[PDB]
Ligand binder design. Structure first.
Ligand SMILES: CCCCCCCCCCCCCCCC(=O)O
Length: 110
C-alpha cells in the first residue's frame, strides 16, 4: 500500500510542474535515500529534467539522505531542515546552495 513518505515524492514532483519554463532557477540531478531506522531501504532520484521523481540510485551532483520519518516531516515542511540536521539526525552531502534551493520549495508541499 501507499505510505506517508510516498506523498512527499509526489508533492515534490507535482511542484516541479509549477516552475514555468519562461523562468527557471536551478535544475540538476539529485539523490534521495530512504533509510529505515539506520540502514537504507531504497533509492530515489529527482528527475528535474523531465519534472518527475523516480526511484533509482546514481552518481548525482548532490546526495540527500533522510529517513522515512523525516521524509514526511521535511517534505511537508513540518520540521526545520536546519535544526533537524543540526542534531546530526540527517546525513546530506551536496552544495549548500543547491540544497538551499529546495528549502523555500518545501512549503509548496503539504
Ligand atoms: C533542502 C531539502 C528539501 C527537500 C524537499 C523540497 C524539495 C522541493 C523541490 C524543488 C526542486 C527545485 C525546483 C526549482 C528548479 C526549477 O524547476 O527551475
Amino acid at each position: 500500500m501507499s505510505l506517508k513518505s510516498d506523498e512527499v515524492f509526489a508533492k515534490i514532483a507535482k511542484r516541479l510542474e509549477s516552475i514555468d519554463p519562461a523562468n527557471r532557477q536551478v535544475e540538476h540531478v539529485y539523490k534521495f535515500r530512504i533509510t529505515q531506522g539506520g540502514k537504507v531501504v531504497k533509492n530515489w532520484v529527482m528527475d528535474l529534467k523531465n519534472v518527475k521523481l523516480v526511484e533509482s540510485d546514481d552518481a548525482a551532483e548532490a546526495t540527500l539522505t533522510m529517513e522515512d520519518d523525516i521524509m514526511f516531516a521535511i517534505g511537508t515542511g513540518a520540521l526545520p531542515a536546519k535544526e533537524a540536521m543540526a542534531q546530526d539526525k540527517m546525513e546530506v552531502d551536496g552544495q549548500v546552495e543547491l540544497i538551499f534551493l529546495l528549502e523555500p520549495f518545501i512549503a509548496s508541499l503539504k
